[model samples]
Target chain A: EYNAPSEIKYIDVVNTYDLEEEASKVVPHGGFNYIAGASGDEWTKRANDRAWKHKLLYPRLAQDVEAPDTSTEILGHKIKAPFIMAPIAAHGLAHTTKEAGTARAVSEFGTIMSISAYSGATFEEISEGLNGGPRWFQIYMAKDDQQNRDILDEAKSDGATAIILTADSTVSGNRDRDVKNKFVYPFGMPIVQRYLRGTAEGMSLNNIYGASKQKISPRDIEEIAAHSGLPVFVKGIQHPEDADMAIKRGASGIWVSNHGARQLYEAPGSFDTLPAIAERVNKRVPIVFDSGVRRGEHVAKALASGADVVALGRPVLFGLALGGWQGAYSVLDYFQKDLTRVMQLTGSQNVEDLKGLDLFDNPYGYEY
Target chain B: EYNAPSEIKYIDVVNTYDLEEEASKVVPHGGFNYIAGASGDEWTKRANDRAWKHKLLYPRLAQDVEAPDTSTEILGHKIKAPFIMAPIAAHGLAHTTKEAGTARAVSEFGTIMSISAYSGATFEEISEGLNGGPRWFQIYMAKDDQQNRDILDEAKSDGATAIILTADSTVSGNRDRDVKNKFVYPFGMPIVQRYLRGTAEGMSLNNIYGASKQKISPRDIEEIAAHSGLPVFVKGIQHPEDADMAIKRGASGIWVSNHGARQLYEAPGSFDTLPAIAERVNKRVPIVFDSGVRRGEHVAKALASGADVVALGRPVLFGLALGGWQGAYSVLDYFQKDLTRVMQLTGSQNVEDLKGLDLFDNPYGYEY
Candidate 1:
């Protein structure tokens, strides 16, 4: 029997917004602020929602898109579709099983799961939960030289196929909500060693150094990549210059993202910047995408603009809220099923067929 | 005694959204579309609004400043403020006096008003309303060479200081709303002129050789500049290549606009493109700004970002809905007061002080 705790039905899931609103009433203020606030006035976050409004859809009226295909390739590995599970911090707060169940769900859904450097579980424990699943390691380059290299080597030994390096956070953003809440994060997370680099029973995130700060140099990245030998990718690369740099530095791929509006408030929408970044990269390396990707058609926009794969973040979070492991699996299934329908409606039969789909030619007419 | 709609409060003037809503009620659906809908999905129209959002404000607080100044110079003329009333079509639909009332209000507000080429009243009647008011003439540059020359000559003869020839409208956008609404335009719109020309009743818009499909060309432009003799400006120059062309062919100024998002939907925000255009123009001519100017702060952004003057479009239209002549005056007054307050808050003593006040550095944390 599935451990579906809430008595709420599927239709009731539409009220997730209300649930989040109510949960804020119970959680300590700091935790709530950490989840809600972005840098500056959070203009970039607002822009993400607004950009969706500007996108126009051409829904197929009568054509039969029966038996649509959602299967696609990422880093040369075929998966269920364009939908990949994005990395996030502290999964234990939501469920007792923590991210171990997430790895299991990734195996069942037949899509790639990105295990964060900040994951609460041990590398071996999460990998064992994978059961020969298609998954990637999310790497956060630490300020310390030796520890960063060790983490990468450990992830590769644990069977992570590729590496996604997040670049947007060298310094913490001015997230006022987090400062106000004073929420203790490690208590809610089981993956303390991975993120904080401390022992479990006698916990101490104050590693050999006083505290953990994300300060990595170019040299640290080279060492980590050389150690892993798994295709290295840097997530949150929005600018073309950054994309070019990734390609130049032996990165096998680039993940175009803005950390879901966590780092900068007014950063350009990832979708809005995708085309230029894609154009500049010119297929030197595979480009992956995430952020502001909710609906299925966005997959087409990403692929058409330059993405070889896209990771869906908030939907899985919503799934975890609604049904935990089973919920995440169901959401990924919906994406796979929906992707086939979208591809056909856009007159694309295979992944390669998506290239000629002209978005600029049929411009969406949302007024500024 | 405040002849400019004394009864109406600034807050009561209505929002931009309300203007489109009210416009639908006054004009038939097609006519409303004519003024509202942009080509394709109206991206360009939305671009104007997006430009405002992209403008990150850097407010300077606790400056011990008492009052702010709104006065800024334009082409050697010290005006009331940096903002101007942009030229739009057929004011008769907005109010009974239409062009005359708008001109009177601009005069009362002590700011410059650009006269529209497509006006309900004769050119002299619009000029008479301004009396000794500072004004510019907006050029349409009809498809016919002779017509282009005649209109520019008329504008110059009637007290116009400079002539603005729009360069982007080589063809009108695909306004599906206007087409569906059957917006026939006013009695003397561009479509109606060709129909009214040549005969006793003159060639009415419908009676022209074909439908309103003729486009403006380079030859038509040269003819208009030759006849005007006064300073000639080129409005609606979106691309850098166009800027080079405008300067090469004796254009005295460049007005950066997207025609108030009525030409294209979700077009790139005007401010998004201002910096690039400013760089290419290299101060070759004074650059005027328009499209989505909603507030006094917007006026400052446009100026700081390299615009010599900012133009009011839909805001004036919104004023028209509130009380015609007085509506125009009240709105202009609001801008003057609001702009002055912003200047002082930003530690500016005058418009000259506004130039390098450092909006990029303060609040938004930009370095440009």
Candidate 2:
């Protein structure tokens, strides 16, 4: 019991690292590269992973915490764990079940799932699959104002509790991995294509023409919140000034991200800049975090680092590709179990208690 | 060729990473663990390597820097490159040729070698091997002031140019790797054992008895300088205030190190702390850096970060163990060649020009 079991043995499949290895063996190379690749040289991606090593979550003994509750809330609604499913593009490329299958697994665990604006399934299909599960909608705003308005209206119609305006990706990054693979994304983005008015090429990302590539300023945050009638989370906030700007423009939440390290090569790791951003926010709004989250401990670390909720991206997609509903279900379940294990070891009774725990440099010396 | 050749291919080293792998294969396993392992779970060692990735040295185009000069001076003495061999304990544990073999290689390059007070070879043996190579004496400080004074006296007698007082390691850390190996030092230290007067156990580090284990203060720095009539560099300085204290106490150089990550697990990576410490010193004294230096590029990064010269530890030892003099020569020569390569690409014509170059975050539109 001193050592945790290998992810594959305990979870019936594999964990994030091994899941990628398994998926890489099974998935089309092109699709795998498109899903896995990040901006130039992938330096910021590495930094995001490395930043997690900067501080360690210290475990306290003898407090007797066991099988602790992992439940957390978003917009006042309780969910099973601090883990959230990030909105990633083109789930069809991962599996035949697509976003609907992923949505079903999230709903089964009573957790939140954020659907991508580039979602392969239409909102109605995902809504039908949810079984009333909590979810948010991520907006990759259309260049046309009317289409952008319709996208928000449909999200509200389909029962999205929040709107996340992905504020970083004005244009895509220099993803050398995709270029090396000469990747062509084959999946049809059914929800996004309808808004594109047949202008988006199916073989390409459809980002160039459909998503407004310029001038997504503070005004857009205000407009997005007002138009959606749902809380708007400004994603991709790195600098403290940007955090202030988002709050000033009436964003209901702040999402600190560098777009899965996919938007800018030199962009600071979302976690690297999180504390200052969180401090600047001053708890004005909830903070959502994503990018480079791999293990159960990362959830605890992110919470301790000031994220109210954490999101998973490539790991989730790999799960869907490997086992569809069962695969995705196991991955989410594994996170809850792993996070609970960390809580029990650390003497944390719950998610809130875990957040209050400090990440110490190290517990050493006789004086300590 | 966009790709640089592997260390094994170009330099016969097998590089730092592979050098360890190769050495672990050939050397006695117990001695290998003692040589390679660091304190605690070795987190700071990994941190030291990761910190190099924090900022990048940008390459410029068309400035016509071909075969740039890598020569630089340390404490007013010109050397072939910025790389200096750090003083590591007991080269006898690594190879039969010992410290003398390592010293001969440094002399061939006209580079400086700092001999450890825990050195297995006596000053005369290493001095004979030097062939007039510039060298320093690393004072571990015999507990008795008379013996400590004699150690310094003998170093002056042995043609030493500088004195490095290793200011950390008041006590040995809980090195679990060594504990697991149940290791014992097999070689004799004629120099240190004489000072110890047959007190230290031949099987252990000998640090507990001989080294002044208590209260090695600023007074020791002043006393060592006045007594030895050589510049005293206070090693293991991580904080700005300590840098100030060392400077005020007449330390001729400040060595930013964490004792190769052997003394403290949570101690900040020496490179991580170099900039702040260097800023505090403000060019009053030259800075020598070591701990987690692997690549030749690291020498450049440390210099860019604010070190005047960089020292190498385990890598040099690995080189000594694997090929003795020829092997050690290959490692030092590779650093000079590799550093020269970085200089040419970065448009630096010499060491002074390289120091003038800025380490930018990334050469992107990132106006960050």
Candidate 3:
């Protein structure tokens, strides 16, 4: 029966690298810039991963650890793990199946799912598809308070139980990849357009929230959280002092981050600041951790260093670029499997024990 | 006819390259080995000095710090400044005048003094020469309990107030320069016979505590302390775990050390671990720090990092090489001057404030 199966298999996360390399062959300059270019030398974007690298973990040797439960709690809500899908803009630009495909695949993995403010699906359509799956809505929290409130209220009505405030795009940041790639968003980009079914007047189909005005304010953020009945999580805090301020400002959760090392060149890894912030915050509030988390060791290290949850924004994007929804699913599946292995080797039978351990006694530091 | 001092002398601590190069000319190989070597691969030794290089100190801009008092206490005894004369053996190998010359010159500056157990002096001579000035007995604590007890009893009767037990030298470690230059101890001639003073029945003068029949033991250490009637301080502790053990062993104080870099090559600088060990020890016992501490800033950094006192061992020898007694005085003068300037810059008016101050508010890890 011949050697191997001759059928064409579905491509997802694994096909991503292949497609990228293949595409680079056709449009070398364009593909290279799109995939490689980052804003202002991408220090912050790079820190996103560099921060994760700073995290060290503890492996309790000889403990009676069993199969690990990836399920972790964030702000009193239990989910598969601390990792969640970061909100990114314009998925259709990467592939045609876009947000719809990503939602379907990610939901199956039991990981936290968030509808991007710039996702390609309409809010109503995405809600309909993930009817029973865990999901939240990411909002830009427009500079205009009313527009921000209207969007938050709509998300609440659309079965969204939480709102993740987008802090990275406070203004049009130097998203060098998109700028250099000339990636364009189509009319059906924001899920809101689908919810309105093209009836939300004055909200241009060509723009995401505040695209015309190009500025978001603290006032806008306040209004969104106050108006939205769901729990609000603030993303993009990278300093201990600032983290302290965020917790004081009544934030439900604080995401320690540096926007994936994309903003400044040679930025201090956010993870370097994470432990201090975690130490100072003293567990008064849940802390979300992100940047450069590539595997289970990263997960274990981050959690050990005081991160309640961590997410990967770019890796999922890489998956989307490879096989629409299938690629993203495989990426998450890989995370869970790898994390389980790290848990086993560390002798952490459960999530609580894993979180309770410190690396002070561990040799070689927190490097997983 | 002493004409006005012509060649405007300079003192060096910061520009290690220059001092290192100059020191190489006199003692060359042995000097380099003693100055640069550390334990194991010397990773910890290098880390020690690098700790100083990596420190972030907030240099005061316009605030009048005024002339700061360098006086501080060590093991309950008041001494001028926190800086003391660290013990280094076989100085005759460096320039000739040896320990006696160093003792006389250091006394001229009114600083605390520590004479080595291996120094070419009877316990009474070093103590008497200083006129009962603040003095410490640095001991080798021989293998035989009787010899140890004898030396301790002599030191106590001779007015030595504190016992600093050097823990780093378990066995004579390698120094690369000594190997390269083929430099042997006692420099110009064999002086050990004279220093030994013929305590053995049928042998040439045995070094210090007569001829030894066995290796160093803890009982010998106990005998030394019991006989001396002085507070016993243990030196050469770098690890925090070891620090805990040292205190548990009934030691009065801890000296974070590397034995003047002669024992380990390319190791963490002794100054590097001073602060960390201080943090770990958390004031359980007084800590006297040394190794790679050459400048006033370094002394300040060490004290700020929680060192109760600091010592400059090699520079004393360097002073000897520069000009015998006058040279040793030059080294202390340079240290005092440097400390004054750094104090002014740090805005500390007294030793108490210096102990509590660091130049930087939040130091970044690994300045390099």
Cα-based lDDT for every prediction: 0.64, 0.76, 0.62
Flag the better candidate by TM-score, 2 or 3. Answer: 2
- Over the stretch A103-220, how does candidate 1's per-residue lDDT look in tens digits? 7777887888899766766767677768888778886665556766777777777778998877776666666555554444544233335444444323322231123445654554
**Residues A1-368, model 2: lDDT tens digits:** 01111122224654566676564334566766677778888889887877777668787888646669998777988989998888887776666667887798789877888998888787777887788888899887666778788889878888889998987877778888877876666546676655544444444653552356467777788889889889999888888778766776788988988888887888777777887776555455788888998888889888876788898888777732222222477788888888888888877777766655567553342233
TM-score for each prediction? 0.46, 0.49, 0.46
lDDT of 2 at A9: 22
What is candidate 3's lDDT per residue for B1-368, written digit by digit as tens?
10111121334445333554565566545444554454455566556656776766677776545677777766666766778888866565555556666776677677778877666555555555476577787876555466666666766777778888876666555554445544434322122233344422222212233333236545444555666667788888777656655554556778898786655555566766665566545445688888777778888887777687788877777666656667667778777778888888877676655654534533565653
Candidate 3 docking quality: incorrect, acceptable, medium or high: incorrect
List the candidate numbers ranked by lDDT, top first: 2, 1, 3
Kindly give the number of clashing pairs for every candidate: 36, 0, 51
Per-candidate iRMSD: 16.1, 17.1, 10.5
TM-score of the B chain in model 1? 0.82
Best by DockQ: 3
- Residue B27, model 3, lDDT: 58
Error of 2 at A176 (Å): 56
Candidate 1 accuracy as lDDT: 0.64
Off by over 4 Å in 3: A1-368, B1-20, B23-48, B62-64, B124-128, B187-223, B265-267, B359-367
DockQ agreement of candidate 2 with the native complex: 0.01
